[model samples]
Structure formats: C-alpha cells, structure tokens
Target: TTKGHIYVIDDDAAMRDSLNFLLDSAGFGVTLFDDAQAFLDALPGLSFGCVVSDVRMPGLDGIELLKRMKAQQSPFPILIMTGHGDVPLAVEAMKLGAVDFLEKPFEDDRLTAMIESAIRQAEPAAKSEAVAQDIAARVASLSPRERQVMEGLIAGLSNKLIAREYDISPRTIEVYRANVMTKMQANSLSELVRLAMRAGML
Candidate 1:
C-alpha cells in the first residue's frame, strides 16, 4: 500500500528505533532522528507525514522544537511524547500547535491512531497550501494600484473608506476594484474575499 512518511525523533536510541520499526512494519515509511536539533537541521528541504517526538531532549526540547517548526512555517503535524511530570508542558505544547500529546507508556494502538490522524490532517493542509499559492500567483497579475484596492477590499473595507484612507476618489476606487475582480477572475466581491482569506491575506 502506498502511504506517507512519519518521523520518529527521541534521545533514547531504543525508543526511536522501536518506533521506526513499528511504523515501518505498518507500511509507513519512517525516519528516526536522535534529537530535535538533528531534525531541525535537516528540516529545510524536508516534507513528511508527521513528527513523533519525545518532549524533553537535551538541546531542543519538544516544546522548543515545536516552536522552531512554527517559526519556520513548517506544516508537519507533531505528536508530542510527554512523560508523567511533563503533562503540563505537554498541554502547553498543544497551545504551541502540536497535533496531540501522548504520555510515555502509551498504548501502541493509541500512538498509531494519533499518527494516522496527523497524517490525514497534514494532507489536507498541503492541498490548501497549493490552492493558496495558485491564488497568490493569480493575484500578482493585478496592477499595483489594483492590488492595493484588493488588499483593502479583502480586508472588508468599503470603497468609500478605502478611498478616504488612500486619498483617492470613490469613483477611482471603484475602477480599481473592478480591475482587481476582473484580473483575479472573480465574479463577485464575496468570492474574491473568500479566496483572499484562503490565501491568508485577509
């Protein structure tokens, strides 16, 4: 069966090796890293199904690693492994964008379930990102002034307000708005707004 990769990162060699073997046997491709730094160092060109990592490594702990992933705009979903005393940190890790936190000694089935869910989530995000990139390319075809109008329009600003803010006439703003709509191939302002939001420009 065709499936995606899962990265298993932990300081414990046995833990990383065992997880890699388990996932591999389940028909998932796996990558094992010794620590978070090792993972991040290799992350720039990396794309994977998800990350399964222990929370208390020496240099880049789980929380810090998750933070760095976010800062780098990494889209890989992470399943955090926390020990008994790290529950509080694990909960906070979720706040930092970990898909889920699994305590140590977790049942293998539970861990597998979490990884499956994360993989499902990541695939959709990758699709959405492609859509956003396409939208950005389409939007870039607009004139500079039209782009400004689009920026304001997508922000839900009224034409009169945009005119006032930009020191332009309402009629001129309307012209720019129409140009933007036509250039972006949007039939309606609402449709343009939806696309802009999807592209994360709203």
Candidate 2:
C-alpha cells in the first residue's frame, strides 16, 4: 500500500498535471498540490512515498517547506526541481536538506532515475522498528496540547492557525513550539527530520 504515494508540489498546474500523468502511468500513486502552503496544509497526517516539489514558489517555497518538515520531524525524502540557471539556489536547498535537485525541462530518464533514487533513500527500515518505536515514545512524552502544536507546526501551519486550532494564544503556541523543538534536541528542522528518519519515520 505504501509503495506508491508520491506528492508533487508546484505552483504550475501544467507541471503538476504532467508529473502526475507521467508518474501514475509508470505505476506510482500521485497527489498534487498547487503551492507550498497547500502542500503544508495537506501533509500533517499522511506518510508520503516521495515528494518532488519546485524549489521556489509563492509563500513557503521548497526550501522553506523542507525546513518546516524537518522542524516537525517528518523524514520523507524530497526531490527539488529547479530551473537550469538556478544552481546557486538549488545548492542552498541541498545544503538545507533537499535529497536532490532536478533541473527543469527535465528529461524523463533523469527525472525517473532521480525520483527512484530519492524514494530508495527514503525507504522506511523494517530493521529499525525498535529504535523508531523508542523515538516515537520519547517524542510522545509531550503534553497532548504540545503534540497538537507540533503536528500543526510540522505541517507548516501558521502560528495563528495553530493557535486557533488549539484554542490558545499565539504566544503560548510559540512557547510550546520552542519546547517541542528543544525536547527533540533539534538544532534545525532538517536535523530533527534526519533523526526521525534514522529512527525509521520515513
């Protein structure tokens, strides 16, 4: 069931549809999001197989979305798509935790290969079950309210949205968020996701 669960996040309708058609035809499951914000809003409770997203978009953008995923400790692999001339930005994204970058006007061969590579890297480990359970438990020690905040945060929900959902003040949300990050011992969001990945969250 988990074998096919790709999510494509891009602002371009044509790009999203094209990738969906290609990936689906190739026998992979696909979901498309129009922008980073929508992608974030949709991410909280699902486990994505692999994500191929544009590096730059309105609002959260790819790098920012990547960072946010890391923040919430989601370890799914993400493949970044960038324009041919955007190597510098792409490099920065890689530095921030993108699995790989595919230049736009991407050839099917290259894109498919990269997609497979990213998914291979993102594979959840059966051997790490014990360690993953331990990590999830430790993470679960947080208060219910705090966990709610963390989930919304990892989903890249805005502070205001989280506050509203939790029926708390924005200031309180910030404090709880900081505590969650601190308890996770995460220096950056990507680092947190890396830990979860190592623990078999992906």
Candidate 3:
C-alpha cells in the first residue's frame, strides 16, 4: 500500500525523526536505524529498497558501512548524506558503490527525488545492467594523478578545492580535469556524473 520501503541510518534522534516524518509523508514505509552496526545486523533479512545514511556517525561511520555493504553485494541502492568538509568521504562512498549523495540541509523535493531515483535504479530491470565494460577499461588507463582528479570530481569537489587538496595550482587541476573528461569520453560534467553513476564510481 506504500510507495516502497526505505531504510534510514543516523545517530541523531532529531534527524532520524525528521527523516521519518519526511519519508512517511511521502508515502514510503520507513525503517530507521540508530547506527551502522544495527543496520548491518538487520541487513541480511532486509528486502530491497533504498538506504539513506548519514556520512558522519560514531562507531562504524558511513564509509565503512558502505564498504561493507559493497563487500556483501547488498542489493539495496544507497544514498549518503554529507555535511560541509565531508565531500571527500562522500566521494569515497560513491566509489564504493553508493548510488547517490545528498548534502545536509537539502530541500525536501531534492531528497524525495533522490529517493525516487534510487528506487528506480534498484528495479529489477536495471539491477543486472552494468556500465559499458569499455568504461572500466578507460578507467584503468588513467594515471595515478588523473585518478586522484577523478576522485575529486566524483566527490563533487570544485577544481580550486581539488587543487588545494592536492597542493597544486588550479591550472594544473584544470588540465587533469580535462584529461579525465576526455579519457572517460564524457562530453560534459553531467555526463561524467552519469557515467560515474552507471559505472558505480560516483
């Protein structure tokens, strides 16, 4: 009778209540977890749906949870929420097979859209589909530096920030970015994001 089931993990009681309200209002059957381990304990018996988890939490943070989920080949599509300065960590989550990410203080509509998108992507028709294998091949062709730039892009970091993170000039960052786009055959930033989604990189 509901749109679908959604599992949310967060340590903050207020945040959990807010999310429960939001998803319930949106007609989703929502289940909340107070910590990563709690979610893992329930994961094996869980039905397919989207997992919405906070990026920062005590004891088994989002990144480790994501890595473990990937290792277990969890069928659920994951959506991670991040706050300021957590972009790198969120990017790592994406690389670990998260379907999408949301920044904290996001709009209700955006959150709803992301959840809906994750649900759509988790459908059986899309489950077995993989990004073109050649994309994987192209990814392997990247140099280590380029790979770093790629990670920055996947994390939704700006060129200036990525440059700063690598302690390099913005101009050099631009070159690396350009090379990544070209090598990945992405015509635009959105295309790159989509490719990453398809390839389970972003």
Off by over 4 Å in 3: 125-202
Q: Clash pairs of candidate 2?
A: 70-189, 71-189
Q: In candidate 1, what are the lDDT values of residues 1-202, reduced to their tens digit?
A: 4467887888898898779777877778888888667788989877756888888878877678878989987778988898999988888778999999988888777888888888897887765776777788888888877888888887778888898877777789989888888878799878998878777775
Q: Point out the higher-scoring one by TM-score: 1 or 3.
A: 1
Q: Tell me, what's the RMSD of every candidate? A: 2.8, 13.0, 12.5
- Count residue pairs with overlapping backbones in model 2: 2
Runs off by more than 4 Å, candidate 2? 1-3, 125-133, 136-202
Please, what are the lDDT tens digits per residue for candidate 3 over residues 79-195? 888896897888988888888888888887798888898888787633554445567778888888888898888788888889888776787888888899989998987887887
Query: What C-alpha lDDT values do all the predictions have?
Result: 0.82, 0.76, 0.83
Best by lDDT: 3
**Which sections of candidate 1 miss by over 4 Å?**
136-148, 151-158, 182-185
What TM-score do all the candidates reach, one by one?
0.83, 0.63, 0.61
Mind giving the per-residue lDDT tens digits that candidate 2 earns over 128-193?
545676777757777887778767876678999999877988779878878878777777767666
Candidates ranked by lDDT, best first?
Answer: 3, 1, 2
